[model samples]
Target: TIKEMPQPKTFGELKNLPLLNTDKPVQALMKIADELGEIFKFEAPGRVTRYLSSQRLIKEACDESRFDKNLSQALKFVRDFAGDGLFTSWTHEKNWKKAHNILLPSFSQQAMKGYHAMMVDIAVQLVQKWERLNADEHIEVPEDMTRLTLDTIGLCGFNYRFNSFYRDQPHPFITSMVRALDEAMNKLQDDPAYDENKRQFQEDIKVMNDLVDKIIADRKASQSDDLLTHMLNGKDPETGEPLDGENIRYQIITFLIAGHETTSGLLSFALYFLVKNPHVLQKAAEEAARVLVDPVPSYKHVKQLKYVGMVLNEALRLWPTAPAFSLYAKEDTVLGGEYPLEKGDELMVLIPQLHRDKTIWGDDVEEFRPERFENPSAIPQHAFKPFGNGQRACIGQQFALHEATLVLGMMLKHFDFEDHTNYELDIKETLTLKPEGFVVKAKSKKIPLG
Candidate 1:
């Protein structure tokens, strides 16, 4: 029997128009989800979208036999700038498999050790900038975090330097990339100024493409051991095929944009939580101090900061940087053992709500408690997937995690943060989530002699 899926109705008719809040789509979905149940459908003219929020539904959705990645509208728009790059590529794209095989080794634990110096180099630039700031001046949390991540990826991935910290404004590559992505995400609305916006949008894509082409050309002309070189020189183990130039260009574009945004949001949100919850900050700081005996934490030093890791994990639960990913049925099937889904029927896994579900997380879902991740075994299956799921899961996740943990520990060790605004947590969504209008005042802490 096909179970009826609950959907919003108007005038005794399913509205052929969209219902989600254009400005804040996730918050809008959360509102409707409370009224409906775990699984519900929404219509937008010719399209139908099912939203899955429970572990049971998502657990079932994870079954590779029944489902696979379905690129959302926003992801498709990203392809305009990213091309058939790793993140924006379709599951069936040949480059997806080829690039995955070739670049897989470059992000491993051993690989991170090689990139550790470059990560530290960018991170040091951040602290130096912060250390020079006046005690009274408030730091824009998101901007600095973005700069840190952008510079780190640039240096580590391809031996290019963005030098985001030295300049008051972000690098041109970052500025153009951010504008392009923001335009892509907000293109859902009817803009009266579409002509000019469209022109600038195209121009932004050109800027990114030209810069990426330069990075690729430089790598090709002069040999290096960076990720770009890996793609340029490495061959696919399966077929011994070399990545074509277009895919290599797209991969550079993909890594620069996809690599920085999500990790930057993670750091920003973690810092926001720490400022709000002093006890959590204290514990994290204590762990940082204990583990990081050196003035600057080595890669080994970061791995031992388990409590700091918990803080980051809990922050991810509260505000997953990417927020959601999509999946579609491979064939006609019933979801959650009831809701019938046809082949190519798309559903979104809403991570924010799933992480906060009362059934799994109990009543303290709203609170910031890092201890929740102390025993990973206690968490329910398919309940927490901030990175994503299946074969298309985030490839740079290990790099993101290591960079975040090391940077967070370094920040905690050298400074103490104060939330003078008592700012409420509000998110600004543009393909990802970051705290809107959030700022922190940092005062240097007394470091133990090295």
Candidate 2:
């Protein structure tokens, strides 16, 4: 059973206009937490959502039978760019169920193991390339990590390959992806009711969509044993109906967009924290140098590097991928069993604050301490959801975790990053949070992973 906070306000009396008008989302969200406390009323017309910063409340909102449908109005806006599929569909939709079951096997442990080697290969290549950068040469940490992950999804999920590594410039696929996401996030920023990257967004969608269409078509011509082939061959066990072309398009496009940035945030913040905390960095690096001497990782190896895993949990605790994700109440309910809410009401999650709450984390909640995760069980249930809550929790959670751990372990094994120029992680938020000007210069430690 879940616990409750005492009679918290059901809603904030202040107009949500302050939230709607802000240019900086991180700052805006922090203000929302300050004014509203844990749970508050959203006063904007059609804004029936309850913005919450409490862990128990966030979990209760995820209880499927009661609050499964997403806050449709806003996500529907996002669907305009991709198409109709899981991220945009209601939890009750038969399509989501069918696709979820069919796609589920593709991310299982056996399947994830198949994808692991591809990630290891890329990490090795990244190590080789960074070896050439002269001391003090700058590297964009987010872009570098983002490229590897996209390539991971491409090679691992789509079973395709390309020049998808960290380089002087982004590959064209990444270029188009960033622009389309820019326009989408722009609208979410509630920017003045005009599109800034309008033409680029539309044109890029054509190229991105056409490429996916072709890949789907190519997969149709063969019945190979790869993941793309698996997706093409998958059918609903109950109805035995193959997913139609449109839904498949939405699924893959969702994979491209959704999986890419979240992993990037993990990688970006991991580097940021490691550079700032030298003692923690030394311990992690020492372990990496001992266990991951060859720059390749197995699931067993990832599990053994306890401190590295702790560092990831800590980084995600501070900066979640999405600022807040919402679920609409399907029936009348109470948040934390204390505040009453009606059917069709909205539930917004302020994950950043919920994870950082001093009560759950103790007085040093603001500090970055990986040791807190030495035994994650000591954490109260549902308090540490960097990936998210139960069922609809990240399906690709293990895939992202293994990929990030391997890449982080390999980097720690091979290179030493020096914050040659002082850089603060000034962040910007949209559907996801990102480091605005985070960059680093890496030097080869010459600790040959022989």
Candidate 3:
């Protein structure tokens, strides 16, 4: 009932570069998608894959009956550091299910309500740090956001404190992860000298593992219904077996890494949008001001910042942090009932392109309009999957949204943001995409009186 997507030129003929380049494959993918169409078939070695650039194709791809998530390419490399963690585990891996069940309730609305104080505590640290600085000071938006999210996850997930803001440099754990993820992304292609950076990669893994070990050790000496305790105490309802130590370590590493990376990027992009679109910022800030009458935002107060939530939705639509994820056919199936796909054949959903699908997002697709998200039902199903899709989708979807919305509300309540140096949006892509070198100046709108 549908036509096959055009592959106007063979993938090889179109670019001398590998299908995915290490530095900025997203830009290349966007260009390729535009040149072809919503979906394109590529005949390559090992597999014939389709790159899905629209929601319609991806809507079909999202169906769990036909497609399963593929921890393909860089994600496979991520498995080395993350082990069989939820984010990098094979779709069929039993550990994902076991850990998912054990950890699911920890991210529930009631669970998040408990974490509210910790979330605010870390967010306040960022605000206090900014307040101490001069209004003219240029803040590295992404790095500080990284600190905020990493510290938030630490406090909420296990009551551990990274104290990232207290340090001048990023915590060693964060640095090691950034390097490891970068190396993993680049390793997908461009085989260099065999031992090139391999030793460093292993060392980075060790450093990350050591930090998580400390987190676990600290948790064993602690309490208060945190995730580590959940994993430590939780049993598989079906198997009646507790998670083994090795699996517990993997789950901790997964939450520590997977939890913060995308959410930080979300905050970074959301801030960038606010600075660029002042009117939106004004509206969002007004919501924050009205909702957060007290100095600190409560869990219920975060719920009332509906316009700020819209701003975040727009940011996610524009620059989905985990930009591209793969799905593979479960059996011999035809995509869209037209393009034939074989068993184990893979496809990638390019989120940036899919979000910009003109058919749904409309002619003003590039505009940073938060109101576009106000009418949720007006948007089509499967069209706005920033967090991802289906059963294997982000377990922290609610957590990330809650965190981003709260930070945005608090940020607006405390400061006014503008481009630090007329910076353009330049994304730095590793396992996730983030705004590279984007900085902003924040002037205190309401300084904390302590």
Better of 2 and 3 by lDDT: 3
lDDT of 3 by residue, 192-239 (tens): 573878888999999998988888778667557878888989877876
Task: Kindly report which residue pairs in candidate 3 clash with one another.
Answer: none
Off by over 4 Å in 2: 1-15, 189-199, 217-224, 447-450
| CA lDDT of each prediction against the hidden true structure | 0.86, 0.74, 0.86
lDDT by residue (235-278, candidate 1, tens digit) is 99676798988888889999998889999999999999998888
lDDT of 1 at 430: 81
Q: Of 2 and 3, which scores higher on TM-score?
A: 3
Question: How does model 1 score by TM-score?
Answer: 0.95
Prediction 3 TM-score vs. true: 0.95
Model 3 stretches astray by more than 4 angstroms: 1-5, 8-19, 43-47, 190-192
Clashing pairs in 2: 11-40, 11-41, 12-41, 49-346, 50-346
Question: Model 1 off-target regions past 4 Å?
Answer: 10-18, 190-193, 220-223, 446-450
Name the Cα RMSD for model 3: 2.0
Looking at candidate 3, the ten consecutive residues that score lowest on lDDT are 8-17
